[PDB]
Design a protein around this ligand. Sequence first.
Ligand SMILES: N[C@@H]1[C@@H](O)[C@H](O[C@@H]2O[C@H](CO)[C@@H](O[C@@H]3O[C@H](CO)[C@@H](O)[C@H](O)[C@H]3N)[C@H](O)[C@H]2N)[C@@H](CO)O[C@H]1O
Ligand SMILES: N[C@@H]1[C@@H](O)[C@H](O[C@@H]2O[C@H](CO)[C@@H](O)[C@H](O)[C@H]2N)[C@@H](CO)O[C@H]1O
Length: 237
Amino acid sequence: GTVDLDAPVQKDTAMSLVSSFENSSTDWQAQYGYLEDIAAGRGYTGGLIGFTSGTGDMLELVRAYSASSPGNPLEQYIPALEAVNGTDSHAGLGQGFEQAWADAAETSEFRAAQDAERDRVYFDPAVAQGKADGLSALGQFAYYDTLVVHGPGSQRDAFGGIRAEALSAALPPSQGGDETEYLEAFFDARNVIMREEPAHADTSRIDTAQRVFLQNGNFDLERPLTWSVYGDQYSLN
Ligand SMILES: N[C@@H]1[C@@H](O)[C@H](O[C@@H]2O[C@H](CO)[C@@H](O[C@@H]3O[C@H](CO)[C@@H](O)[C@H](O)[C@H]3N)[C@H](O)[C@H]2N)[C@@H](CO)O[C@H]1O
Ligand SMILES: N[C@@H]1[C@@H](O)[C@H](O[C@@H]2O[C@H](CO)[C@@H](O)[C@H](O)[C@H]2N)[C@@H](CO)O[C@H]1O
């Protein structure tokens, strides 16, 4: 490879790939207002990368939004988000919270808060670890999508654990290993974890997208790209 995932065109391409996986649309800027309980046990899932009320990151996002934009319509729901954190309960939230999310998503400031939380927790750590492992943009993207779905952490079902399992099977480029063999190992490790949860059992984001880019040798993740997820085809010129 020759460019990292954080280059401006590659980053935009990354956001469109993840929106195709999360919302079945390459129009990633239409997804800041997404808010749904997809009934997989995480409560509400919201925004560009599926921040959730069950796992702490929706809370972190709304707190940061409230620091940067006092009095916004989500701030009053901070106590409820604190209370349901760690559970999939909607208690204290409901239609008023769903409407306040919709309202906040029309503003620059909420969109900026989502961008910041995405970059601090998920995207910039994927890029930094990819580069430390000697990976191309496509490798960096493999790490980013893993962080989006599985989150950070060293547990076997989080990004750090998936990466540890890959490293046990294949050396990364930074240690002399071949990138293709490393990413095939990484995708194999990730698919094991995906298949352990019924909501993640469909691995097409890997098998008919990421693996395709690797097969094509598209290490810089350059356009034009074509891929499928959930049996639907997508293209980015
Ligand atoms: N065109 C539909 C096709 O969209 C659909 O597939 C479903 O699409 C959903 C939106 O992308 C997707 O939901 C996301 O799932 C991920 C994986 O858990 C979550 O992280 C997101 O929060 C969800 N929004 C479904 O998983 C996916 N099955 C399909 C119906 O099955 O039919 C086509 O006609
Ligand atoms: N958006 C969630 C994401 O939060 C979650 O991953 C967890 O994130 C926690 C806080 O960021 C972290 O402490 C924990 O170790 C992660 N596994 C994943 C997986 O539950 O789901 C995403 O939808």
